């Protein structure tokens, strides 16, 4: 009976919550109470990157911690040099409606996608000296919210069709499709070891996935609205989520439950982008109120605020060496903070 | 200068890239962006046919004016996540079928098709991302509405309607009902045009509406407001 199946699902959900409540012997706040507070963190805008003529929707950092790519609705995907504010490349796009961009770890490729539901892979290093479309990945039935590179041949894409995918670039086919989200997936974050990745969707749920098998090991709940940004802790045993309910939450995979929430009464707007510092102590979240607040991971205290963007900060990124963090905003500007 | 030879050449490449970006941005600013919306088989395809995946982009030039029309009828996702990408469009072309009053929606008979069109219009007109964007309202299927209004009355869609079965009164009532959905009447203005399959002046109506929008925008820019 369908009612019997629903009752069984409810019983399994009660078992899950009972087990999680059993594992909650002591919260993060009590354990990290004695830690010396981080203190106020003031970060000046070292570089401002100008040249975008529309809202900046995406931004990613190369592995070298110097070259970054930026995506905007002007139809262009600019690779910047952070140290010297030079434009290494400017890539025209067939579709100007882009929402995400990626930088390959090898740095040879850059991926871009958006409302066309196509992940376009761009070959930066070519004999002809120009950036060219290498592969147009098709198959999704909704807007691409985020794409991240595993290596030169594998890429993970999250779409508005409630399905994440892992592509094999050489053949342009879907190696495995991830299903289980009721709402549209809005962000994904690969583990540093690259065998798992977290997907945050509009169902207020974040799900762990195994890239090789295709099953969802854990599903995380607690948010009251759409999760816009997700990010892995540097360890890979934890991740943070940014939602529209103006709260950021830190989950751990092994304990399978949330640890604590990053919320303030003054903050009403939803978190658009989230990021972590190299040590994981600082949680940088880009808010819709033209601000980017830096939090403390182990204590709910807010260390500092990075102001300087006229419009909504749409993307965030901390370098691999952790020295600089970039805030891209709808006001057509990029800023490097240190 | 304290710059190497290749450093200077890299800066020169950056300046050339900046020049190309400036020219492309000026070209884009010269262009007119229209967002095309409709509910079901409202005639959106027909009006696309007259003028000339997720987004179907159509470009055309009419009277030295370059037109971008974006169609998002195939997205089938949460509209609030991607509706802010279209903030800044010159005008929103809303397509509504007049014959939908008699027909009921495919999914369940509880909801009438025209009521779903009204709900979409209320969500789009009153959205916070489109507070200053004018709307071009295309009411299609005039021949179908003429044929239907004789056989079936407008009271089925509108029980409060107490008027003649003639085309003019019913069309005026439908247009007035759609125009009342504009809460911010001061910020925007809605242009309504009655079109059919054989109509050939829809492009002219769109051109006039965009001309008015450009006039108002540059009045605001010039300080006259």
């Amino acid at each position: 009976e369908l009612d019997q199946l629903r009752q069984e699902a409810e019983q399994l959900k009660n078992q899950i919550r009972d087990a999680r409540k059993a594992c909650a012997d002591a919260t993060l706040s009590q354990i990290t109470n004695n830690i010396d507070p981080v203190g106020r963190i003031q970060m000046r805008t070292r570089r401002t990157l100008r040249g975008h003529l529309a809202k900046i929707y995406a931004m990613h950092w190369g592995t070298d911690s110097r070259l970054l790519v930026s995506a905007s609705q002007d139809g262009k995907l600019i690779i910047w040099d952070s140290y010297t504010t030079n434009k290494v490349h400017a890539i025209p796009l067939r579709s100007s409606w882009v929402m995400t961009c990626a930088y390959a770890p090898s740095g040879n490729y850059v991926a871009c996608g958006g409302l066309d539901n196509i992940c376009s892979i761009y070959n930066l290093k070519t004999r002809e000296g120009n950036v060219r479309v290498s592969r147009e990945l098709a198959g999704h039935t909704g807007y691409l919210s985020c794409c991240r590179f595993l290596d030169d041949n594998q890429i993970v894409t999250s779409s508005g069709d409630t399905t994440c995918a892992l592509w094999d670039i050489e053949t342009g086919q879907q190696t495995t499709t991830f299903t289980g989200h009721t709402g549209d997936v809005m962000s994904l974050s690969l583990a540093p070891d690259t065998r798992l990745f977290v997907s945050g969707a509009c169902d207020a749920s974040a799900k762990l996935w195994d890239v090789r098998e295709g099953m969802c090991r854990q599903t995380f709940t607690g948010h009251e609205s759409d999760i816009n940004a997700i990010c892995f802790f540097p360890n890979g045993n934890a991740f943070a989520t940014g939602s529209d309910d103006a709260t950021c939450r830190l989950f751990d995979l092994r304990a399978d439950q949330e640890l604590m929430t990053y919320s303030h009464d003054n903050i009403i707007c939803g978190i658009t982008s989230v990021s972590f510092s190299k040590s994981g102590r600082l949680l940088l979240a880009g808010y819709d109120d033209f601000n980017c607040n830096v939090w403390d991971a182990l204590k709910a205290d807010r260390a500092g605020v990075l102001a300087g963007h006229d419009n909504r900060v749409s993307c965030l990124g901390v370098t691999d060496d952790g020295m600089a963090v970039a805030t891209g905003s709808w006001d057509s500007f990029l800023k490097i903070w240190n | 200068c304290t710059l190497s030879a290749e450093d200077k050449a890299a800066v020169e490449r950056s300046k050339m890239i900046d020049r190309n970006l400036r020219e492309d941005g000026e070209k884009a600013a010269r262009e007119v962006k229209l967002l095309l919306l409709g509910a079901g088989e409202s005639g959106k395809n027909t009006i696309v046919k007259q003028m000339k995946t997720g987004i179907v982009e159509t470009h055309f030039t009419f009277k030295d004016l370059h037109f971008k029309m974006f169609d998002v009828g195939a997205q089938r996702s949460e509209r609030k996540k991607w509706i802010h990408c279209f903030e800044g469009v010159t005008a929103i072309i809303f397509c509504v079928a007049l014959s939908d009053y008699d027909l009921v929606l495919a999914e369940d008979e509880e909801m009438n098709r025209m009521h779903e069109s009204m709900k979409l219009f209320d969500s789009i007109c009153n959205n916070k991302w489109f507070t200053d964007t004018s709307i071009i309202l295309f009411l299609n299927k005039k021949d179908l509405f003429e044929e239907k209004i004789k056989k079936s009355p407008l009271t089925i869609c509108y029980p409060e309607y107490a008027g003649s079965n003639t085309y003019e009164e019913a069309a005026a009532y439908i247009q007035c009902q759609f125009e009342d959905l504009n809460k911010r009447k001061d910020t925007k203005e809605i242009y309504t045009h009655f079109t059919c399959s054989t109509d050939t002046k829809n492009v002219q109506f769109v051109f006039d509406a965009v001309t008015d929008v450009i006039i108002k925008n540059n009045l605001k820019d010039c300080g006259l407001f």
Partner: single-chain antibody
Amino acid sequence: VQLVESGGGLVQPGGSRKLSCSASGFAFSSFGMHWVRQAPEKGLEWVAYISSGSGTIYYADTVKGRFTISRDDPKNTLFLQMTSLRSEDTAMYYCVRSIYYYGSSPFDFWGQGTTLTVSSSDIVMTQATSSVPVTPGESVSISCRSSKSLLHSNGNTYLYWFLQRPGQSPQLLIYRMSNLASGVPDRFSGSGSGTAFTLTISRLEAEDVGVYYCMQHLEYPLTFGAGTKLEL
């Protein structure tokens, strides 16, 4: 990618000729372009350089005034107009492409060469040996020296290595003293202390015979080395 060069021919002293380099297979507008001269029995010497968009143009002191370099982007060709020729210019002329961004590989591709026959504070690079016997399968180190330090404040040391096989145009081996060029076998490697630099080949095949030149890019009067010849 190809750079076919036309021109040359017998020229009387004091005459004038035009050299045309035709580009096919790459974005000509993006690449900065150079002209390099190789004497019939001597090494390479820089002549002129034109940047992307013709923004900046630099000549050597020898050909300053007499020579002018211009490019035609729409027709994908590069022009070198020579006037007041002398017996100092009788040589083979090379048309070399160079692109300049972060991580780029300048002097990547070289043209075949066209022969011009005339009838009858700059950094100094020294490669002392100029000829060394070698055995296949062994390891060889080639040394070059610079009058001034090639290390800039940005941390980039601008030294370039080129291989000129017998009857073949120069091919880039190492750019900026450590980075292997695209397609060059991994056996080659480079190292240096900022004033003196070495190029090391772990193993030698029959393809490695040729003359190796050390070039500098710190200041635009680019001076090539005399060259070291490896013969078995």
